[PDB]
Ligand binder design. Structure first.
Ligand SMILES: Cc1cc2nc3c(=O)[nH]c(=O)nc-3n(C[C@H](O)[C@H](O)[C@H](O)COP(=O)(O)OP(=O)(O)OC[C@H]3O[C@@H](n4cnc5c(N)ncnc54)[C@H](O)[C@@H]3O)c2cc1C
Length: 272
């Protein structure tokens, strides 16, 4: 038998109750929500995400999230959230709508989840099912390696796939992650990524870049560029799948042009 799934229908919203909220650091939270019973699982295929929706100051707001939990976790779903507070970043004085709304929730409050969503599903042992659009059949392709470029919150789609591969000892897919952030302080999920590197270095390659670097810095500084893609993703001759998730100017200016310069087919670079 298999556990009961929570996300039974992708057009249904499921209000889930907040049970724990961890202050990871000043602006990072881990929120745990209860599933309908302690024996349920979420029902989120690897590669897909959920949406949160709420009425936030009178207007509907919907945003995608990839949990840090998996379908191995019974009874709960965990989201790691960067809270974008007002009056912090000069280009974003209002801060972020859903992340500040999540920060305001009280234990016992509910929020609507929906899913699964997303055009990519990882089928295991290097095989990805990628739809060109939602109403269309997936292209299945099997790769030996996966390049991953994450910026900021775009790490959680990558971590979900990395963790699904590493937990299968007979999955020989090698993942190469290049993870960009504004500063060293702003990096999410660093201990979790470094645990995976400690345990799985043969199949997991980890590199960081930061827009501005600390005094003591072992990795890259600046935006993702051609050199970093040569040095930190599989070469195009190996025909890796390239996955990306990050802010639009990062994808548009830093990632796609440089993936193309290296020779990866741009048309095949998938953005979550
Ligand atoms: C597939 C997928 C999975 C995701 N998973 C996660 C996840 O697990 N965790 C997560 O936290 N997010 C995740 N995101 C991002 C998430 O969807 C939202 O974009 C994020 O929560 C911010 O939404 P918001 O409503 O708070 O901000 P919005 O109101 O939408 O603000 C717009 C943008 O303003 C910028 N911004 C606002 N304030 C600041 C500031 N203080 N500093 C810097 N920039 C700022 C941010 O770049 C923000 O995205 C994911 C996105 C995708 C596509």
């Amino acid at each position: 038998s298999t556990p009961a799934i929570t996300l039974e229908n992708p057009d249904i919203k499921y209000p889930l109750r907040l049970i724990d909220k961890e202050v990871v650091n000043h602006d990072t939270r881990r929120f745990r929500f209860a599933l309908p019973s302690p024996e349920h699982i979420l029902g989120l295929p690897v590669g897909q995400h959920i949406y949160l929706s709420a009425r936030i100051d009178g207007n509907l707001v919907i945003r995608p999230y990839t949990p840090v939990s998996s379908d191995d976790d019974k009874g709960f779903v965990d989201l790691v959230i960067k809270v974008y507070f007002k009056d912090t970043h000069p280009k974003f004085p209002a801060g972020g709508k859903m992340s500040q709304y999540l920060e305001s929730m009280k234990i016992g409050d509910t929020i609507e989840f929906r899913g699964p969503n997303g055009l990519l599903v990882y089928q295991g042992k290097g095989k990805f099912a990628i739809r060109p659009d939602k109403k269309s059949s997936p292209v299945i392709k099997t790769v030996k390696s996966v390049g991953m470029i994450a910026g900021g919150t775009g790490i959680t789609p990558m971590l979900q796939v990395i963790r699904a591969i590493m937990k299968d000892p007979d999955d020989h897919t090698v993942c190469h992650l290049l993870f960009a952030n504004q500063t060293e302080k702003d990096i999410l999920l660093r201990p979790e990524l470094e645990e995976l590197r400690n345990e799985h270095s043969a199949r997991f390659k980890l590199w960081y870049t930061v827009d501005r670097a600390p005094e003591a810095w072992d990795y890259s500084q600046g935006f993702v560029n051609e050199e970093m893609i040569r040095d930190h993703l599989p070469p195009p001759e190996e025909e890796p799948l390239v996955l990306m998730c990050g802010p639009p100017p990062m994808i548009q200016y830093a990632c796609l042009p440089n993936l193309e310069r290296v020779g990866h087919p741009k048309e095949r670079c998938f953005a979550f």
